[PDB]
Each structure stands twice: as C-alpha cells, then as structure tokens.
Design a protein around this ligand. Structure first.
Ligand SMILES: [Mn+2]
Ligand SMILES: [Mn+2]
Lengths: 118, 114
C-alpha cells in the first residue's frame, strides 16, 4: 500500500446524520475509512441528547473509547452508563446499543474490522 | 462485553534505548481482541519514542496535550482532538516537549502484538 502519515483534526470532518430503522439522533465522522485502512476503520460518533442506537448485533466486534459525556450502554440484560475515559469491547454477535440520557452531546470513538464497512 | 475506566488499567513503564518517559496501558489486548488491539500511551514531559518502523499501521487519537510527531524527516506537533494514521512501514516516533503529560490512544492489528 501507500506510504506516509495523515494527521488531521477530527472535527474537520463534517458530522453526517445516521438515520436507520434502529438509530436516531446520531451523527458520524469517518476518520480512517475504507479508502485508506488496511485492516480496521476509525469513526467518531456523536449522540445528540435523547439519541438512541437500539439493541442490535453483528458478526464483527466493536472497540470503543468514550471521548465526551455520559454514554448509556444497552446490554442483553439491562444497561450501564459510562463516561469519558471508559473503553468498551463488544464481542462479535453480542447484543448492544447506546442511549444519551443527558442534555449535551456524547462522543465516542468506534473501531471495527473493515469487513464490516465504515 | 467489557466496560472499564482506562485509567484503572495498570500502566507499564517503558525505558529503553529507544523509548523513555512513556507508560503504556493495554486496554483491549490479545486475550480479547480477534483482530486489533487498543492501547493508551502516556508521554511524560520530555518523554520520547524514537523513530522506528514496523510492517503494520497505527491508528491514533490524541486525547490530551500537544504531541510532537516525528516523521522520516522533520516533525509535526498536533493537539488533543487530532487523529493520526501511520501507513505500514512509515518511519515515525513521538516526543512531548510540554510541561504536562500527553495521552494518545493507539490501535494496531494483532500481528503487532499488544
Ligand atoms: Mn454495533
Ligand atoms: Mn510505532
């Protein structure tokens, strides 16, 4: 593949609205996308106040790092809120979702193997 | 599912001929991860990761402070809120020229170890 290094302010990427049957009040920035990533992609998600990523699962893992705010994590059984400075590992096929119960934006980094897209 | 405060992971001090004033936390390691690992590095004031390369990429996010990134030639400082993509085989390293600790998240494919 190519050489070099990219160094960029994440906020220089516009936050794009995610709207699907199971996601509302969420925006995403693709930081290191399919066009460049050899193995895995880096996204920055913004959950607006009251935003929801419904419980779901997929046949790849998630690696998450919470950057800002209080993120409510939905589990197969119940939920738990974590804050900036927490990491999350979600196994392949594990049920998970997210909610923002606060009045400010919540941000988290989310990385997946590139076979799951960007 | 694992949910944990990164700070609570015990950092490992690194002090070698090429790395000094650096601590490393393995957040999501080989034990858990099927494809890539998540580390958090803390660079003390004056700390240094000297120029090196490896056959895998880095994906980095700067969490705190002003990080000096060493390039094959020259260097570039970036701040909290920057991401960095280092291509496989690219010469790189890091320095902290400030008076406070710098933190960055760093992910590599699992062939890189943890
Ligand atoms: Mn998911
Ligand atoms: Mn390296």
């Amino acid at each position: 593949g190519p050489s070099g290094m990219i160094l960029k302010r994440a906020y220089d990427v516009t936050p794009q609205k995610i709207s699907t049957d199971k996601v509302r009040g969420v925006r995403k920035r693709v930081l290191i996308g399919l066009k460049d990533a050899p193995n895995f992609v880096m996204r920055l998600f913004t959950v607006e106040p009251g935003g929801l990523i419904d419980r779901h699962s997929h046949p790849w893992e998630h690696e998450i790092f919470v950057l800002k705010g209080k993120l409510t994590v939905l589990k197969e059984q119940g939920e738990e809120t974590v804050e900036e400075g927490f990491y999350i590992f979600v196994e392949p096929n594990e049920i998970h979702g997210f909610r923002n119960d606060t009045d400010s934006e919540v941000e988290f980094l989310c990385l997946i193997p590139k076979e799951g897209g960007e």
